[PDB]
Every structure is written in C-alpha cells, then in structure tokens.
C-alpha cells in the first residue's frame, strides 16, 4: 500500500490518497526486507518524471528534479525503480550492482 500523487486524487491537483502498489520490483523490495532486516513505507510521489538536470528560472541552475530530488533533498533514502546508470547521476548518488541489463 503506497500513497499517491495529486492526479491520482482527481479532484484537486494537490491532495493525495493511498493506492495498491504492486509489481515485481516490489517483490525484490520484499525479498531485501526479509534478508536485510528492516521495515519500510513506500510512497509513490513525484511530478511524474525521473528528473534529470534541468534549468531554473535563472537562479542557480542545479536542481535534480523529480526522483533525484526526493533522494538528494532528504525526502527519501532509497530508490527502487527502473533507474538507469549514467555517470552524471553517478556524481551525486551511489549505485548498487546491476541487476538487469
């Protein structure tokens, strides 16, 4: 069970609401949790983009919007998703071994 973004709550473009979140990547997550002892609460929140280096309104020009935003700015602490490996992303993040080519 993971909470959702705005448009999943169709009324307002701001509020959120839980959904059933389900896939095999989630199966890998559960396997990890079993072997690496911890609990977890997953939340499917974003704008809808992975969020590579964008521009700004010409203030600082280093954002890492989206998922990288949730990872860097203290929102989350792990990303389980089809996330590619890109040496730009390898500057600020730490990657695991590859598990799907």
């Amino acid at each position: 069970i993971c909470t959702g973004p705005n448009d999943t709550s169709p009324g307002s473009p701001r509020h959120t609401v839980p959904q059933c979140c389900y896939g095999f990547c989630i199966d890998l997550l559960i396997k990890l949790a079993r072997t690496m002892q911890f609990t977890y609460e997953v939340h499917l929140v974003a704008d809808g983009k992975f969020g590579t280096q964008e521009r700004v309104q010409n203030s600082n020009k280093k954002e890492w919007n989206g998922m990288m935003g949730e990872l860097l700015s203290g929102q989350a602490d792990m990303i389980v998703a089809p996330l590619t490996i890109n040496n730009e992303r390898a500057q600020y993040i730490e990657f695991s071994k590859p598990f799907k080519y």
Partner: protein, 238 residues
Amino acid sequence: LLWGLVFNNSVPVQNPKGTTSKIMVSVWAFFAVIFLASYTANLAAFMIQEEYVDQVSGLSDKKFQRPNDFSPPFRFGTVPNGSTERNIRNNYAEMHAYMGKFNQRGVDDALLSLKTGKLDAFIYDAAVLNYMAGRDEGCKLVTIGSGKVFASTGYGIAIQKDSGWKRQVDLAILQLFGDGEMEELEALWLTGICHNEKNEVMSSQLDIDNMAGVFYMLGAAMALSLITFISEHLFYWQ
C-alpha cells in the same frame, strides 16, 4: 468431360455435337489453362524454404529438464571441470546427472562435434560464445538471443580491500560508456562480422515423402469407392 478438361486430357470422351455448346466448353478450357498455370506457379513459389527456423528456446524449459520426453532426446553438454559445472550443479542437478554422457575435451572439439550433428545444443560461458559465434568461417551456427541468460554477472576489475581510490576508476569507466567507446573497442576486437546476413534460402531437393499427405488423400477416395461398392447389395435387396 469438364473434369478431363480442367486437370489434364485423360481419355476418349464424347463431344457435345451442338453448334453452341462447343463455345461453352471452349471458354471452360480457357479457364482451365489459366487455372493450371496459376497453380503451378504459386506452388513453385511455396517450395522455397527459408533457411532458419532456428529453434528458439528458453532456459528453464521443459525442452531441457525433460530430455527423454521428446523424440530422440537432446545431446547437449559442457566442459566438466570448469565453473559453469558448479554453477548448475547447485540449482537443479537432475539435469546434471543426465548430461554426463556428453563431456567435451575442450572448446574447438565442442564446435566441431556441434557442426556434425553429434550435438544439438551447447551450454557454456556467455562471452566466450558471443566471441566464437562471430568468427568461424561458415557461421551456420548462432547463439541464442542475449536476453535470456541464466546467471548474469560481469567482467570487471579489482582493487585493494580498502578504498585506495575506487570511485575514480568507477567514474572513469562510466564516462567511457557514456561517450561511446566500448562499442568501438568491441567492434575492433570482440564482435567480428558475420552477425548479419540473417538467413539464406535453399532448395532442399524434395525427396522426403512429404507428399505422404497427397498419397493419403488418394487412399481416402479408394475407401469411398468401396463404400459405394456397397450399392451392389442395395440392388440385390431391391
């Protein structure tokens, strides 16, 4: 008469002596010659036999774990003392006991015994194959699609236990990938060429009794005849 016309001139037959029927049979004959020509043409079009059915397969397939289940079973082996031996002997092992009769004294021996039908599939390292399959001369042999691989790991490079400087070479290699040089280096050392030229076409010199079906349909009519031969009683009791 019309049957004789359409298929092939068979036998003495009466001809309709009318001055206009002859017109009808004549145009019928026109239809017949066009028909037969079209038929033989398209059949020569069929008998062309694209080369590679290529016999796709998975990895955890019944085609492997149940060898004797099929028409004469597979003959697929490995190299005994290596690593892949242990890599399989710890997940199924019942395949393993079955595959002992097919060891190979090396690699070139394996390819040689693969070309001459003694084997029908080979199971081994990935990269050594994807190198070998792109080098030998005829290359009438190919690996399976590189999306179904069993235990996918990677050739990499090592470093002292403590991080002397790992992130440096790490970012360096990732930069190599991003710029697009591994591809060129492979094309210069690894791949080789005959990966393209997918499938030729062949003649096959029809010799099998694939016309068996044809023969069978012939026999069918025979039986029907005997059925109608039964009419010889359907007068005796009439």
